[PDB]
């Protein structure tokens, strides 16, 4: 059917707003099972009123339209962000015009990102940054605790625990891209494929960071996970968590590993990276995704230190690679043995010099390539993604053959 907003009370003072779509939201590998999705927003209305995670651009208008019918937006005290991107920032522009009094609650990386993304918006709501073990009291026992859970794709990711309701707001962790009528997750098997596919696409290339996150989240006695996507996780909570533990262990235990180092200004090269990673992991080879824009030098040395191959993905910005890709290249060249398999991909518009530069440097430095250098003009399509996944598989097979 058409996009809607499903509203449901879920705990004391707590309501979920699920923006639902039965169609494919984006051309991203994670939407591949084509079972639709939801973007979940949450409202805690106590002595103070907090809204978690307004949905992105496809959902902006239905969401604001629905929300104003339920809430006087001038009474909104807080907008809490589990993560930040241009997609979400679009909704925030409208929402914060209507709720000029509200304070933004988010992680420090999310904050810098938001400040960038809203540089030319007129909105100037204040931001309160939260780090681990910070609190925010909404009254009536809802003393929230914050838990940064960063990953290469979501550097600003922030989880939130509400002890009054025993809900852990988990943002991108523990979700599933599936649109259904059930607000809650009764039944294990119907969601099992979606949950594993979600893990495989989003989390497997960030296994060390995701393990670290789950380690922190164990300290909170959650009875429910309230994720960005899919049903709320109540009936499948323990089972899903044990499966995560097992899947993470599998990932970090595979004999071969690929360092996939990328950057992306508008998301295109990132979309390609996800696809290539999935082709690699589905072939039984681990991926350590590195977002060069947010990573540090020791991160890269470490990744290159344990990898059997490395792959660079880069956009072209004024005819050059982004600065973080240039510096990552140096660390890589300074540390990688010439026996590592090499790959190059990227998206571009008018020109793709960054790709050419990287291919040349790696060839000159005597590396063997595991797939033909990938060049995508502007926005990736379904076909593009499948080709990239197949390249990742190809890369993986080439590594396995080498032992």
Residue 83: CB minimum distance to Cl ion, A: 4
Of the pair 25, 84, the CB lying nearest Cl ion is at: 84
Of the pair 154, 225, the CB lying nearest Cl ion is at: 154
Between strands 143-148 and 158-162, the pairing is antiparallel
Q: Which of 102, 4, 140 is nearest to 59 (CA)?
A: 4
Residue 271: CB minimum distance to Cl ion, A: 16
Of the pair 73, 84, the CB lying nearest Cl ion is at: 84
Tokens for 142? 């809802």
Tokens 């040395």 belong to residue: 301
Q: Which of 162, 108, 153 is nearest to 132 (CA)?
A: 108
Give the torsion sign (CA, 26, 382, 268, 204): positive
Binding residues for Cl ion, rule: CB under 5 A, are 83-84, 154, 156
- C-alpha of 361 from chain center: 30
Residue 338: CB minimum distance to Cl ion, A: 36
Beta bridge partners of 280: none
Angle at 28 between CA 248 and CA 283, to 5 degrees: 45
- Say how far apart CA 226 and CA 175 lie, in whole Å: 8
Residue 258: CB minimum distance to Cl ion, A: 23
Of the pair 110, 179, the CB lying nearest Cl ion is at: 110
Of the pair 273, 280, the CB lying nearest Cl ion is at: 273
Q: Phi and psi dihedrals of 233, rounded to 5?
A: -100, 100
- Say how far apart CA 41 and CA 55 lie, in whole Å: 7
Of the pair 165, 269, the CB lying nearest Cl ion is at: 269
Residue 56: CB minimum distance to Cl ion, A: 13
Residue 151: CB minimum distance to Cl ion, A: 8
Residue 120: CB minimum distance to Cl ion, A: 20
Residue 305: CB minimum distance to Cl ion, A: 26
Q: Which residues in 245-352 belong to E strands, given as ranges?
A: 257-262, 286-291, 309-313, 341-348
Residue 224: CB minimum distance to Cl ion, A: 22
- Say how far apart CA 355 and CA 312 lie, in whole Å: 9
Of the pair 132, 330, the CB lying nearest Cl ion is at: 132
Residue 217: CB minimum distance to Cl ion, A: 17
- Say how far apart CA 228 and CA 18 lie, in whole Å: 9
Q: Cβ atoms within 10 A of the Cβ of 184, count?
A: 15
Buried/exposed 248-279: b ≥16 CB within 10 Å, e otherwise: beebeeeebbbbbbbbbeebbbbbbbbbbbbb
Gyration radius (Cα) of the chain, Å: 21
Residue 45: CB minimum distance to Cl ion, A: 26
**Which residue number has the CB closest to Cl ion?**
156
Of the pair 82, 309, the CB lying nearest Cl ion is at: 82
Of the pair 78, 154, the CB lying nearest Cl ion is at: 154
- Say how far apart CA 20 and CA 226 lie, in whole Å: 15
Of the pair 83, 229, the CB lying nearest Cl ion is at: 83
**Angle subtended by helix axes 268-281 and 382-401, to nearest 10:** 40
Tokens for 385? 């993604």
Of the pair 17, 154, the CB lying nearest Cl ion is at: 154
- Say how far apart CA 317 and CA 112 lie, in whole Å: 21
């Amino acid at each position: 059917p058409a996009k809607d907003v499903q509203i449901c009370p879920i705990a004391v003072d707590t309501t979920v707003f699920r923006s639902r779509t039965w169609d494919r939201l984006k051309f991203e590998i994670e939407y591949g099972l084509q079972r639709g999705t939801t973007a979940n927003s949450y409202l805690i209305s106590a002595d103070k009123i907090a809204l978690f995670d307004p949905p992105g651009e496809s959902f902006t208008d239905n969401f604001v339209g629905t929300l104003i019918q339920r809430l006087d937006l001038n009474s909104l005290d807080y907008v809490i962000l589990g993560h930040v991107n241009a997609n979400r920032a679009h909704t925030l522009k409208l929402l914060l015009s209507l709720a000029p009094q509200a304070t933004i609650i988010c992680s420090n990386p999310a904050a810098q990102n938001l400040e960038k993304l809203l540089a030319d918006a007129e909105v100037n709501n204040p931001i309160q940054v939260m780090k681990g073990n910070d609190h925010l009291d909404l009254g009536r026992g809802h003393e929230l605790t914050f838990i940064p859970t960063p990953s290469p794709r979501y550097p600003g990711q922030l989880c939130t625990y509400d002890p009054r309701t025993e809900i852990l707001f988990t943002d991108k962790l523990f979700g599933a891209h599936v649109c259904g009528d059930q607000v809650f997750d009764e039944g294990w098997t119907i969601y099992q494929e979606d949950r594993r596919y979600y893990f495989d696409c989003l989390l497997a290339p960030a296994a060390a960071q995701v393990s670290a996150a789950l380690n922190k989240l164990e300290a909170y006695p959650a009875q429910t996970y309230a994720p960005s996507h899919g049903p709320l996780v109540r009936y499948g909570l323990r089972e899903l968590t044990r499966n995560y533990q097992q899947w993470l262990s599998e990932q970090q235990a595979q004999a071969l590993n690929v360092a996939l180092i990328y950057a992306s200004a508008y998301g295109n090269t990132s979309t390609l990276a996800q696809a290539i990673a999935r082709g690699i992991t589905k072939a039984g080879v681990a991926v350590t995704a590195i977002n060069a824009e947010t990573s540090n030098a020791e991160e890269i040395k470490e990744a290159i230190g344990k990898s059997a191959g490395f792959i660079f993905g880069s956009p072209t910005l004024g005819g050059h690679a982004p600065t973080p890709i240039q510096t990552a290249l140096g660390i890589t060249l300074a540390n990688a043995s010439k026996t590592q398999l090499c790959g190059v991909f990227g998206s571009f518009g008018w020109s793709g010099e960054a790709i050419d530069m990287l291919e040349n440097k790696f060839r000159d430095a005597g590396f063997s390539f595991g797939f033909d250098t990938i060049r995508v003009k502007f926005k990736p399509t379904d076909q593009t993604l499948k080709m990239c996944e197949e390249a990742g598989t190809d890369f993986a097979q080439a590594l396995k053959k080498a032992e």
